[PDB]
Design a protein around this ligand. Structure first.
Ligand SMILES: CCCCC[C@H](CC(=O)NO)C(=O)N[C@H](C(=O)N1CCC[C@H]1CO)C(C)C
Ligand SMILES: [Cl-]
Ligand SMILES: [Zn+2]
Length: 149
C-alpha cells in the first residue's frame, strides 16, 4: 500500500512529470491514493507524497448524502486565479505537527483528466479551490511551510 513521505524526503522537492493517461494505471493509483488519504484523515493527496513523481492528485468530496467520494485529477493545470485572496489554516500529511495560515486565491479554474480520462475544466471556490492549490504546489516541489520565512 502507499506510504506517505514526509519533509526530508527529496521526492517531495522533485517536480512531477506530466502523465500520458492510462485508464487501468490510473484506476489502481486512484484506489491506493484514496486509501492513503482517508486512512490519515486527509482531504487531498498528491502522487509525489507517496513517492510517485507524476502529476496526479485526489481531492475528497465526501458527503452525508453520497458517502465517501474523491475526484481524480490527472495533469491538473490552473488557467485562472481570482484576484481576491483568502487566508486559511493548513496542515499537510507530509509535514508532521506543523500548521499555518496561508494566503491563496479564493477561486480558480483548473483543467484535468478525470477518472474516466475525460478532459474537464472546472471553476472551483472555497475548500475545493484551496485543496487543489495545495496539491498542485506538491507537483511543483512546494510545501506549505515554504510560505513562512
Ligand atoms: C487545506 C489545504 C490542505 C489540505 C490537504 C491536506 C492533505 C495533504 O497534505 N495533501 O497534500 C489535509 O488534508 N490537511 C488537513 C487540513 O489542513 N485540514 C482538513 C480540514 C481543513 C484543514 C484545516 O484548516 C489536516 C488536518 C490533515
Ligand atoms: Cl467550501
Ligand atoms: Zn500536503
Amino acid at each position: 500500500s502507499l506510504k506517505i513521505k514526509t519533509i526530508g524526503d527529496r521526492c517531495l522537492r522533485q517536480k512531477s512529470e506530466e502523465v500520458e493517461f492510462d485508464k487501468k494505471e490510473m484506476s489502481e493509483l486512484y484506489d491506493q491514493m484514496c486509501e492513503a488519504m482517508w486512512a490519515s484523515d486527509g482531504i487531498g493527496l498528491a502522487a509525489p507524497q507517496v513517492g510517485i513523481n507524476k502529476r496526479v492528485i485526489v481531492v475528497d468530496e465526501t458527503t452525508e448524502e453520497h458517502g465517501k467520494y474523491a475526484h481524480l485529477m490527472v495533469n491538473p493545470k490552473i488557467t485562472w486565479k481570482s484576484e481576491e485572496k483568502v487566508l486559511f489554516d493548513e496542515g499537510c500529511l507530509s509535514v508532521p505537527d506543523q500548521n499555518g495560515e496561508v494566503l491563496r486565491p479564493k477561486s480558480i479554474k483548473v483543467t484535468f483528466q478525470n477518472k474516466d480520462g475525460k478532459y474537464k475544466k472546472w471553476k472551483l471556490d472555497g475548500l475545493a479551490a484551496r485543496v487543489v492549490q495545495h496539491e498542485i504546489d506538491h507537483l511543483e516541489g512546494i510545501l506549505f511551510v515554504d510560505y513562512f520565512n
